[PDB]
């Protein structure tokens, strides 16, 4: 298997780990802060997905420093992940087009 496909795969597996640790970590940081809503694992996991996708419902988000830190990591991990898939896709098309041109 080519690099770009392996990397993409890797990024996905890595993202899923970050989603999970993120959820856990988020709860850990958020409990104790008055008025925090990011305080149970299940929604925390939903919060991590939307965070990774940069979706934006705003139904949930962190209010503590560490919570937000964890958040930044999930955002980055997510954007990088999805951007890497795009690169992978671009590389695929580029290679095929070259073929279709005889190169």
């Amino acid at each position, epitope marked *: 298997s080519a690099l770009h496909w392996r990397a993409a795969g890797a990024a996905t597996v890595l993202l899923v780990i970050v989603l999970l640790a993120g959820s*856990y970590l988020a*709860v850990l940081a958020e409990r*104790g802060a*008055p*008025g925090a809503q990011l305080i*149970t*694992y299940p929604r925390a996991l939903w919060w991590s997905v939307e965070t990774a996708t940069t979706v934006g419902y705003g139904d949930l988000y962190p209010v503590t420093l560490w919570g937000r830190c964890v958040a930044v990591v999930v955002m980055v991990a997510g954007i990088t992940s999805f951007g890497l898939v795009t690169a992978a896709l671009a590389t695929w098309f580029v290679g095929r087009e070259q073929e279709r041109r005889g190169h």
Partner: antibody, heavy 118, light 106 residues
Framework: QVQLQQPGAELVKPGASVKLSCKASGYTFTSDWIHWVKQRPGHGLEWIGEIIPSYGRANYNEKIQKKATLTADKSSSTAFMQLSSLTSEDSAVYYC???????????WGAGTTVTVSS | DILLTQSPAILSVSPGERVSFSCRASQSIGTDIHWYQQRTNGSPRLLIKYASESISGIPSRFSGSGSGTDFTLSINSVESEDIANYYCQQSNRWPFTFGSGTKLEI
């Protein structure tokens, strides 16, 4: 089988301190939090604080004077609440409970009756 | 912090009659409300989770409804074993909090 085991009672002289215990059994997850709830005779339930054994961090009710300090022993599956410098106001039944990180207390201990008297 | 108001403090009902406990939250908390039963000298026992979810082991007689700020715990055809104190507890925001309770009287 009884998931949470707590001592029936503890007698404490005014000013002294006591350490209550809560031995847990059954399924244990890294996401488990152990809670402590105080209940004075004839009155309602009052949340004291929580602790997550897998990490060891604890949170406490800010609305009330902090009389407790929570700790946990992973090897023995036991959670401890140290109540210090007690008075008659601290006399009550103290329950410990288990929350699977999903917001509700699935199970409670039988509670420990604490009496502050000379 | 979220304040849970349980009124009336005492509810009187005739046997076999349907009864409804009320729990109002100081602010919208979705359905993250949970109910517990506490009989004389006993420990609290989960009856309903997330406002309306049933708990295995609990009589089909118990049911919950409500979302937002107004929640209700209902008992169809009350019976003696139902005599106890009833509390609501929210887990929507930190820290978790409990209602002041309501006593069922037959």
């Amino acid at each position: 089988q009884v998931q949470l085991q707590q001592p029936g009672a503890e007698l404490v002289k005014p000013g002294a301190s006591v350490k209550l215990s809560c031995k847990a059994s059954g399924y244990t997850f890294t996401s488990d939090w152990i809670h402590w709830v105080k209940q004075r005779p004839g009155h309602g339930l009052e949340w004291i604080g929580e602790i997550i054994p897998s990490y060891g961090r604890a949170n406490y009710n800010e609305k009330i004077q902090k009389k407790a300090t929570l700790t946990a022993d992973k090897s023995s599956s036991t959670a401890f609440m140290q109540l210090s410098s007690l008075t008659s106001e601290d006399s009550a039944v103290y329950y410990c409970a288990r929350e699977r990180g999903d917001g509700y207390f699935a199970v409670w201990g039988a509670g420990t009756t604490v009496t502050v008297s000379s | 912090d979220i304040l849970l108001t349980q009124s009336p403090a005492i509810l009187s009902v005739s046997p076999g009659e349907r009864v409804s406990f009320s729990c109002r939250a100081s602010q919208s908390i979705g359905t993250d409300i949970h109910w517990y039963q506490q009989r004389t000298n006993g420990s609290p026992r989960l009856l309903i989770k997330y406002a309306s979810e049933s708990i295995s082991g609990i009589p089909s007689r118990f049911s919950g409804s409500g979302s937002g700020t107004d929640f209700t715990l209902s008992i169809n055809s009350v019976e003696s074993e139902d005599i106890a104190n009833y509390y609501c507890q929210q887990s929507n925001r930190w820290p978790f909090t409990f209602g002041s309770g309501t006593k069922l009287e037959i």
